[PDB]
Amino acid sequence: RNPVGGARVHFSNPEDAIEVFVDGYAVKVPKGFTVLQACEVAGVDIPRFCYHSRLSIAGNCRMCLVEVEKSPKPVASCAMPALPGMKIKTDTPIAKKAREGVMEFLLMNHPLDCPICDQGGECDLQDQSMAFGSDRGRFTEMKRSVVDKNLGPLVKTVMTRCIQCTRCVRFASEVAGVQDLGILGRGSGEEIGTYVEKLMTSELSGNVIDICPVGALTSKPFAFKARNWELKATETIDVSDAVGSNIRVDSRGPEVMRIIPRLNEDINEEWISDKTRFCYDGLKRQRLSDPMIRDSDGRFKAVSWRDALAVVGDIIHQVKPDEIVGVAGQLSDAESMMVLKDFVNRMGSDNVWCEGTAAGVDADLRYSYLMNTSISGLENADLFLLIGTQPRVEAAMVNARICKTVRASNAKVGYVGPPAEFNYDCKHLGTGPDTLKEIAEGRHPFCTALKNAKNPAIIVGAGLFNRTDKNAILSSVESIAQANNVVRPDWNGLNFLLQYAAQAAALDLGLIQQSAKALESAKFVYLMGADDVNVDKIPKDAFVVYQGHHGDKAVYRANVILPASAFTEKEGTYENTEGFTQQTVPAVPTVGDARDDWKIVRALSEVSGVKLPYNSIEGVRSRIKSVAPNLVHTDEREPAAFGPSLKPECKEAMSTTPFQTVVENFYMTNSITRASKIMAQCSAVLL
Amino acid sequence: VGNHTAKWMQDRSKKSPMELISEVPPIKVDGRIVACEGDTNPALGHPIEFICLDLNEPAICKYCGLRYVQDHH
């Protein structure tokens, strides 16, 4: 029998396996599995409300009761460990009657507001009432009622629907790492709340909407907008950061209605950040929809594609080749970056790079800008040393993995960098490179803790990559790693945390800034979605072309605007921090006269007189095969082939400037988020 | 008058339902709980809704918009 949901079962050793019977059937499960898990392996779906596979067992809803032979009482399958020879029955009259009684108790005080409850149509309570207890209600007394609580602009609250499953409280304590929700009172009058007035400030707060089985906690911005049966589901990935969280995009017509997490055990474990979940509002706001050239009065005027491309092509031939600069945005896909690099190199320029701190790093070896441990591999670490990175605001899901590892395996965390608020206990070791020198020289309790660690993990933030003393910092970090045997054939504990979705693919493709001051001497600047570059460094007489879907400052400076597709409207290749390559899936049509980025670059190259040897995205990917073949081998995990030993020795001195903060505002990180009501309100109240 | 009503109502001669329901004074109740059916005949109203009156602010029936307050405290 196939396991429920195709769940995979891993056996450490076949000797450590026991035999249990689920409705006569023989199934084999690892030692330590619960009765419910054995039922899932058998393919039998046990109803449940309070149990969640990613949260500690509670056993309070009593909906998972089954009959076990020689047991006097019905057994809570979610909590009872499986034993050899156990005979589990799930469809006996005892189990069915227990389920009917529990369902009757659940619906006793439940409000009659399905037509106004957003959970309607995707409600576990409705389905289990239809299936297990198809008992005619007989409760005729007065129902209890509960007042609503204010939890912020993201989570809408209707507490009459709450069934006291305590999933939200356990999520807050165990996953979010922010203990704000509790269960107050006693008996039937117990109420989930914060007691004092306070809003849920965790960056993972939005997941309580997913985990709540009833409509007690719902998305406030999504409230009443749509029913689940009229939504089209598209399976794609997020581009808010360099994590590549798997998401499902729900749309109705040419509009994205909501974004909910998608299961991926290796990346985000059915969780997403609040930025990922609530940034969809900006997709329909301040969209660049038509090509524009600034008119005589210095005002933008809408034109056709041919006219704008002719203007750009004509003016790009009037500058020196070293005076052409192209910058790729943080949301750029690999195909457009490759086409941009080819176009700029074929005009005789080498000034192509991706916006962000890691613009001019050494990209020779792939280990030097990727999380070599892998996100799932972090759970095996016994010590964490974070150098110049705030994972909570830089990579929310990576920080969630670190917090989960700390909670479960009692791993230690040492932090070097500016003061920051962590959701887990961690020693502040210092603020800058002097701490790195101290760590290298030893004589510290954390130094011997690092030496006494079996699987230590160093995580270096990409924000340190733009410092003047970058080589010295990297050399010191690698010396620390070598002295403590951090990199071994059985353990790669050296990691570099990127911040932008496009950064990994850009580094793989070789989009590296050679001249450190090429922007200050440029006369033709192509900003392909690079809204985060500082545009006052551009000379006032330079011809600036902006291509993208949003924009605030670069749009003001741009002489020509070329509307581009958004990540929800195209199929593009993105690589995350750990070197995992994924592809987006189109969910909605583009707006106005927008085009895909690589299409725009290829069209301009043809207009400019350069003939690129590809006319489709397949040709672009075949070209990419000659540069970074790992970018076209999508959804594959590959270990590092080369390590620190090949790096040339560096003797640069160590500067005294402390580490700076990369993400000043978690909600304001990209042009999509900066065009959203909800993100602005979160910045206003949740920060 | 709000953005919500302006999406469909293109006549300003009459008050919108939002203003009309807001003009109905809160119903005073002896007790901390009240059940609203939206009609004197329950079969002609909306599904019964039990509303808690523990807060000082008037409590709103989520079906018909009627508002209730505790009479004494």
């Binding site: 406030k220 409230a223 009443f224 | 919500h4 009503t5 939002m18 329901i21 709103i60 989520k62 918009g65």
Partner: peptide, 8 residues
């Protein structure tokens, strides 16, 4: 959508 007074 949610009305200004919170009504559905």
């Amino acid at each position: 959508e949610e009305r200004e007074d919170g009504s559905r």
